[PDB]
Paper text:
Forkhead box (FOX) proteins belong to an evolutionarily conserved family of transcription factors expressed from yeast to humans, and possess a highly conserved DNA-binding domain (DBD), called the ‘forkhead box’ domain. Here, we found that FOX family proteins bind to the non-canonical homotypic cluster of the p53 promoter region (TP53). Analysis of crystal structures of FOX proteins (FOXL2 and FOXA1) bound to the p53 homotypic cluster indicated that they interact with a 2:1 stoichiometry accommodated by FOX-induced DNA allostery.
Unexpectedly, two FOXL2-DBDs (FOXL2-DBD1 and FOXL2-DBD2) were found to bind to p53-DNA with a 2:1 stoichiometry in the crystal structure. FOXL2-DBD1 binds to the FBE (5′-TATTTAT-3′, hereafter FBE1) in the major groove of p53-DNA through the α3-helix, whereas FOXL2-DBD2 binds to another major groove (5′-ATTATCG-3′, hereafter FBE2) adjacent to the FBE1 site, with two overlapping bases. Both FOXL2-DBD1 and FOXL2-DBD2 showed a typical winged-helix structure, consisting of five α-helices, two antiparallel β-strands and two characteristic flexible loops, which are referred to as wings 1 and 2. Consistent with the crystal structure, FOXL2-DBD bound to p53-DNA with 2:1 stoichiometry. Notably, the binding of FOXL2-DBD to p53 mut1 DNA was greatly weakened. These results suggest that FOXL2-DBD1 binds to the FBE1 site first and, subsequently, the minor groove width becomes narrower to create the new binding site FBE2 by increasing its binding affinity via DNA allostery.
Author numbering:
A (entry chain B): 1 to 89
B (entry chain A): 2 to 94
The structure:
Amino acid sequence: AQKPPYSYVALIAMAIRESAEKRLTLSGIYQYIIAKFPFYEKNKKGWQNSIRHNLSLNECFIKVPREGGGERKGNYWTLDPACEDMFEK
Amino acid sequence: QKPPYSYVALIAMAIRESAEKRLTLSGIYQYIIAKFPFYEKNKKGWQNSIRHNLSLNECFIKVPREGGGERKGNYWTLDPACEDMFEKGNYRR
DNA sequence: AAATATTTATTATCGA
DNA sequence: TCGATAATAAATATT
């Protein structure tokens, strides 16, 4: 019972390293973040767009190809082989 | 050829240098160019500086635009006390 | 008209 | 009072 004002930044690449295959999608993001804590909600476009723009400022992300496991838009999103050893932690 | 001039005063001067005084945001730059052309649109560096003046003041108001004026930007105007203050001492050193 | 990602754009924090 | 990192709204491009 307290205020979580800190978890808007590192919730993006988290689902990469918390997982085992390191390429979970927005579906896995949603279901796992929901399964984690009992207050946050996906029924708000505000917080959704907030977490959406949290990915553009820092210049370390990149787009990586994927086949028809859900690809109609195009490639998935992950990190760069350079800013690697700073996101496992 | 950028100006060493007060940027809030730059916005207010652009304001008084018009009749409608409520032009769109995407034209604001052009007007400053009309005075002192230096900057290039590709340079994304010094934008936050002008932003600091645009957002942080106490003589402007924020009012939502009309749905037909659907572009990127809003309209701003001055304050009567700010008007009568700037009308006297606007261009000193 | 509802919800993915390259640019734009208020509140406020730091630093000079 | 002029500049550099973060944290937040509302309107284009993309599927």
